[PDB]
Amino acid sequence: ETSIPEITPFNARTSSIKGKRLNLLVPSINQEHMFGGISTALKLFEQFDNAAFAKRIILTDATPNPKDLQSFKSFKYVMPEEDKDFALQIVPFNDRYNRTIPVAKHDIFIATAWWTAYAAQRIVSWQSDTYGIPPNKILYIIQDFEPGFYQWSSQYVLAESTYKYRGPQIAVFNSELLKQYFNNKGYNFTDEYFFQPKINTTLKNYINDKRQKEKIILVYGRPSVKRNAFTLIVEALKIFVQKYDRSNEWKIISVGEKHKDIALGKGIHLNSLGKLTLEDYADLLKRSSIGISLMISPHPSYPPLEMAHFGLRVITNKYENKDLSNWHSNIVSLEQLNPENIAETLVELCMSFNESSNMMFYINEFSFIKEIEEKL
Amino acid sequence: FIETSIPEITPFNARTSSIKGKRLNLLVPSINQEHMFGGISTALKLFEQFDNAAFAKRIILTDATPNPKDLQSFKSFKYVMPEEDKDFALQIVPFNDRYNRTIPVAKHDIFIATAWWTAYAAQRIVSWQSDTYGIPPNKILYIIQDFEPGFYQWSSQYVLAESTYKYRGPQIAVFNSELLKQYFNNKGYNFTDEYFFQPKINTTLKNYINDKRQKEKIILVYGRPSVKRNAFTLIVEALKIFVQKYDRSNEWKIISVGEKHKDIALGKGIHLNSLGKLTLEDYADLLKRSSIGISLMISPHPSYPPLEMAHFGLRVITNKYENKDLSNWHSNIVSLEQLNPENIAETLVELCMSFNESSNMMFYINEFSFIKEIEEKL
Ligand SMILES: Cc1cn([C@H]2C[C@H](O)[C@@H](COP(=O)(O)OP(=O)(O)O)O2)c(=O)[nH]c1=O
Ligand SMILES: Cc1cn([C@H]2C[C@H](O)[C@@H](COP(=O)(O)OP(=O)(O)O)O2)c(=O)[nH]c1=O
C-alpha cells in the first residue's frame, strides 16, 4: 500500500450558485451500507429548514443502487459534471479521480466519517482562496472517536487530525458522553453540540407490554464490528457453560448480525437470529432476562439501553468516562474486562434470576439545529 | 469461516514441579533471529542482568519454536521439552504448540512477561500457582515495551491487552522509557511497583558520533511499511506533496532505511530508494552524510531513530504523541502537533531552505541499575 485511499483528493471547481447550500458528505446511502451513523446523520440533516438552505448530499465512497435512491425521491440525482441549482440533489463522488465537484461561494459542508471531514477541511481552504473569503464554518457530526477504528497508524493520526483542525468548526457529538471524552482529550472546536440517545419509536410501543421472562441470555453479537467484541463474548460464554452446572437450563441467543451457530460445549450453542425486525426484537426482549452487549468506545450504544429498559440484567463494558451502571439499575459495568469476569458475572446473574433510571431522557431531540442554522 | 476464539489467549496449562529453589521465567513470543526485534532483545538484555547464581533461569517461548541457528545465541541454555522436568540452571522450553500439553511450574517459579498476552498468561498462572501450592500470589515482573492495546483497533484484543494493566494482583512494571511510565500514570494504571529504563545510544553508533561529517542534501526516511506505528504511507504521501510543491526538490536525494521495500515514485522522476536495514556501520555512515530526517512513532514511547538522527546532526521531523514531545529532548528535533501530509511536506520545505546544538537528554549518551533492587523483592 503506497497511498492512503481515505484521503484521495477531493477536487472542487467554481459554481455560479449565489445562495447558501448545505452539503452532507456521507460515504454511502445504500440500504446495504445503511448503518446507524449515516442514518442518524440523514435524520439530523433533514432537520435543516429546507426553505432557508439548498441541500446536496455528496456520496464519497459508494454509488447508489436505483432501489436505494427510492428513499430519496424528492432529490435529483445529478452527476458531478453538471452544475444545476436544484433545491435538493445527490451527487455520486466516489469515482473521483480527475473529476471535480462544483463548490459555491456559500457552500457549507457537513462531515460525518473522519475522512469526509478531512476532505471538507481541505475544500474550505480552496473555497477561501478561490473566492477570497474568510473560511466557512464546517459542521462536523462526530459519531465516535473514529481514530479508535484503527490501530496506531497513518489512518489513526489522519482521522484524529480532523479534530485538530484549527479552522472554524462546529462539533455535533453523538451523546454527551462522547462530547466529554473529546473535552478530556483536550480537543477544541468553535462550537460544541450533542444529541442524546433516544429510544427507537417502534420499541417504545412495546415497553409497556406484560413480559413473561424466560431463561434466555441475549447476546448482541456482531463478528464484523470489532467494537462489539464478539470473540471476547464467545470466550466468556464457553467458560460460563463449563463453570456453571445450571448452564443447561439457559438458552443463549445472538441477535444483531447473522452468523454461523457457535458451539460453546456440552452440546449448547449460541444461536444466531441475525437482525430481527423491530417487532420480533421487541418480543424477544420481553421474554429475555439476561443481556450481554459490549461497545469498546466512550460513546453509548443502543442495545444495552434497550435491554435494560425491557427488564433485562445487562452485562456491559465500562470505557473511560462511559459507565452505564449509573444510567440504569439493570446495567452492570465490568471494570476488568476478560472472559473470566464476564462468565462470573453471568453466573451471578443467572443465580439472581431465582427499577431505577437516571437516564429519563432516553424515553422522551435536535433542538439545537435551529440555533446552529443561525451561525451559517 | 468466522474467528471464534482469541489465539493470543490460548490456555497456558501448568503442572506441579519438584523444584524447591527460586526460578525466573522469561515469557517471550520468540527468540528467532527473524523475529528478533527490539522488544524481545531488550527483554533478553534485561533478563541477562539477574544474578544467575541467585536464580535459575528459564526462557519460555510462547509463539515460535527456534531454528537450530537461533539457539546458537543461547549456547549456555539447555533446550528442554515441556514434558520434561529438569532442574537445570539455564533452560529454554518451546511452548507455542501448547494444546493438551503442560509446562512445569514450581512453587517459587516467578514470571517475567513481555507481550501483553504473555502477561495475560502469567497472571492466570499465578492464580493456579497460588491455589495449587496454597501460597500468597507471587509478584509478576511485567516488562512494558509500549501501550500494546494501541497495536489493535478497538476490539477484543484491545481490552484483553489492556486488562493485563488492570490486574489487581502483585505486579512490578518495568517501562521502556520514563515517557511511557508517565503515559500509564496519566491513564490511571496501578502497579505494586514501577520501574523504567531510559533509551541509551547503541554502543556501535556512539563510536562514530565524533567523526567529521560532510553533510550532503539527503532526506533520510525511517520507512517500515510493516510497522503501522511508523506511518510509512503517511510519510510517502507527504513526500509526494513535497516533490510537487518544492521547486528545489530535484536537488535532494530521498532515502529510506529500516526495512527493505520496493522503490517508490514520488513524481518528477524522483524516487524514495530503500536501503533496507543497513549494518550499524553503514547506517552510521549514512547518518553522517544525511542532513534531514523523517521518523514517526505513533505511540507515547520514544523510538531510537529520531534520537540517533538528531545526535548525528540531522534536522529530524517527528510526531508528537500526548506527553511525548521530542522537540524538548534535542534542538535538532521538530515535533509536529498537526500530523498530516501537508504539514510534513511544509516542514520539509522549511528545513531544506534552512540547509542553505542543544540537548536535554544527556542520559542518552551515558543502565539497568534497578535490577538489583528488584531482585530483593522476589
Ligand atoms: C439487535 C437489533 C437491533 N435493532 C435496531 C435497534 C437498535 O437500536 C439498532 C442497533 O443496531 P444498528 O443501529 O444497526 O447498529 P449500528 O448503527 O452500529 O449499525 O437497530 C433491530 O432492529 N433489530 C435487532 O435485532
Ligand atoms: C535504520 C536502521 C536502524 N538500525 C538500528 C538503530 C536503532 O537503535 C534500531 C531501531 O530499529 P529496529 O530495532 O528495527 O526497530 P524496533 O526496535 O522497533 O524493531 O535499529 C540499524 O542497525 N540499521 C539500520 O539500517
Residue numbers in the entry:
A (entry chain A): 28 to 381, 389 to 398, 402 to 413
B (entry chain B): 26 to 381, 389 to 398, 402 to 413
Please give me the paper's original passages concerning this structure.
WsaF is the first rhamnosyltransferase to be structurally and biochemically characterised.
The structures of the dTDP-WsaFSER2 and dTDP-β-l-Rha-WsaFSER2 complexes were obtained by soaking and solved by molecular replacement using SeMet-WsaF as model. The majority of residues that interact with dTDP are located in the C-terminal domain, with the thymidine moiety forming polar interactions with the side chain of K302 and the main-chain atoms of L303 (with O2, N3, and O4 of thymidine). Y308 π stacks (distance 3.9–4.2 Å) with the pyrimidine ring of the dTDP, a common feature in nucleotide binding proteins. Overall, the loop between P325 and P329 changes the conformation slightly upon binding of dTDP. The side chain of H326 turns into the catalytic site. The dTDP shows interactions with R249, K302, and Y247, all of which are shown by mutagenesis to be important or critical for enzyme function.
